[PDB]
Design a protein around this ligand. Sequence first.
Ligand code: UTG
Ligand code: ZN
Ligand code: ZN
Length: 417
Amino acid sequence: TTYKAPIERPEDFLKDKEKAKEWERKEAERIEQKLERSEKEALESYKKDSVEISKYSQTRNYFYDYQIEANSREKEYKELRNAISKNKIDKPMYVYYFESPEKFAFNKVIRTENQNEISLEKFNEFKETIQNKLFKQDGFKDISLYEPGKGDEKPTPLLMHLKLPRNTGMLPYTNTNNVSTLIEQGYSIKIDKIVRIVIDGKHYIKAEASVVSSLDFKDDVSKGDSWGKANYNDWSNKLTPNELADVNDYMRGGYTAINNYLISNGPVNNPNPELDSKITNIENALKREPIPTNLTVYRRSGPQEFGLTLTSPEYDFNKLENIDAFKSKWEGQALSYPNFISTSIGSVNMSAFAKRKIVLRITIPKGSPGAYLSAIPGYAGEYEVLLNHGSKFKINKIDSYKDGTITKLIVDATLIP
Ligand SMILES: S=C(NCc1ccco1)Nc1ccccc1Cl
Ligand SMILES: [Zn+2]
Ligand SMILES: [Zn+2]
């Protein structure tokens, strides 16, 4: 039943640097024979501009489809992405890399770079920050295949020991006299265990991390639409006529009256049985065929969703103090929506919400209520997934990016069951 690999390796090289580097060099030479000339050229460009190429691969998919196509960095992105995808690994591989604790919204400082010790207080604070959370990792990154020792670069107090699952793209390559391994990331990680370790008198937190598989179509709306239609083409027929009629009414513009009623706390202030009945039916419809796999969706959120307005000075994310204030208020916090929440399987910008500065990137766990409404023909919504009213979201991490000269935010959140 097991595939025999061309160059044998264990799942983890552990502290064995010599054996890891030997394997990595042999793999780099082996995979080089599978690469196309345009793929080899993309790898050469990568070594001369890795920082900018990596930053581009993190946020390229948030633009309009025509902007992605027109971007001068897109050709290089596609070629380097294809190169890594030429070596999907046959069995899991544990990798190692140093990470900033800020990557997990930990701002209390594990220890300063010049400091040695890690207090029990900071270790416990870090544990409570990362426990029971998923964190999206995205973009090109170089990783190591063995545990660092004395002679190795250790730029932070946090060491990631991450299990890459089978079929993850991994590209070992040569760079002048050295060898490195490139991955594209693009998955959720969970930190299962943290331990204090000592390397040459200095203390580090070693984080045992694993990938929690999910669908994330990003700018590939065609692939997302195929998945949505494969799972929800027969959804309309699973509903009662009243449920289907209320879902249809909502989709055709009834969402304004229903959601305004929910936002205004209408069930408490002025109960409307006709609106309550529609809400009941739509909620039931969303529970008929739960989201069948962990799924990432994207919502271009209005400032009112985060207690701001279009003219609020706090909504100007071009100022670093406004980003820091937003992160302080929302990172690690829960956000509950009284209304139904429309999202898209695509991360691309859309003309209807062109100027919205907040991109809510939601991971929906398997079994959540929801439905791919765009499986119903002739609908305005773009590749739409509707989430149930009253949904709660845990905000895990917030990032920023530039959309032209306007700074926008990416809010990495998880739907709570
Ligand atoms: S940050 C880091 N590894 C990640 C990496 C590979 C290339 C560039 O950055 N340090 C390290 C060095 C040697 C062995 C193991 C580790 Cl974790
Ligand atoms: Zn010590
Ligand atoms: Zn309700």
